[PDB]
Amino acid sequence: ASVYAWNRKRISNCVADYSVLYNSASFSTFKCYGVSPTKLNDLCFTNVYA
Amino acid sequence: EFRVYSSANNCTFEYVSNLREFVFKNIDG
Ligand SMILES: *[C@@H]1O[C@H](CO)[C@@H](O)[C@H](O)[C@H]1NC(C)=O
């Protein structure tokens, strides 16, 4: 989607795998504010928004 | 005939799968 019409998708009721995204070795930027990205797997929230 | 539901807002969890007895509790979500 365009920047003025940024799309949203909620995700819940599933098992995430952040390490695979971490070790994709293809992204250019990766900044996580307030959380340890390597310790993301050892955390549990209610829902995420992409 | 299904004439009850006439909307689609924000959704959340969705699950699909003599006499009869049932009990329904609701605690801590
Ligand atoms: C759907 O529920 C969430 C939960 O708080 C709320 O933030 C959101 O505004 C709701 N959507 C609409 C269209 O009301």
Side-chain angles (χ1 to χ4, degrees):
Chain A
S2 311
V3 59
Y4 67 94
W6 47 277
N7 198 16
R8 192 191 202 76
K9 177 179 182 94
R10 75 184 297 268
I11 291 158
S12 164
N13 289 310
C14 55
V15 191
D17 198 357
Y18 303 101
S19 294
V20 169
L21 185 139
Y22 207 107
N23 301 331
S24 167
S26 43
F27 305 147
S28 75
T29 61
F30 195 49
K31 270 82 72 175
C32 297
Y33 307 103
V35 289
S36 166
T38 64
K39 305 289 109 176
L40 273 183
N41 282 353
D42 313 334
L43 279 167
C44 193
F45 308 109
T46 176
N47 49 0
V48 302
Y49 291 121
Chain B
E1 294 180 30
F2 170 73
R3 302 184 40 242
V4 171
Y5 181 75
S6 66
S7 164
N9 282 320
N10 62 6
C11 292
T12 304
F13 169 92
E14 168 175 340
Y15 188 91
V16 184
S17 173
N18 314 312
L19 73 164
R20 304 141 164 76
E21 313 195 312
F22 304 89
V23 179
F24 312 125
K25 296 173 63 179
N26 174 294
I27 44 171
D28 278 2

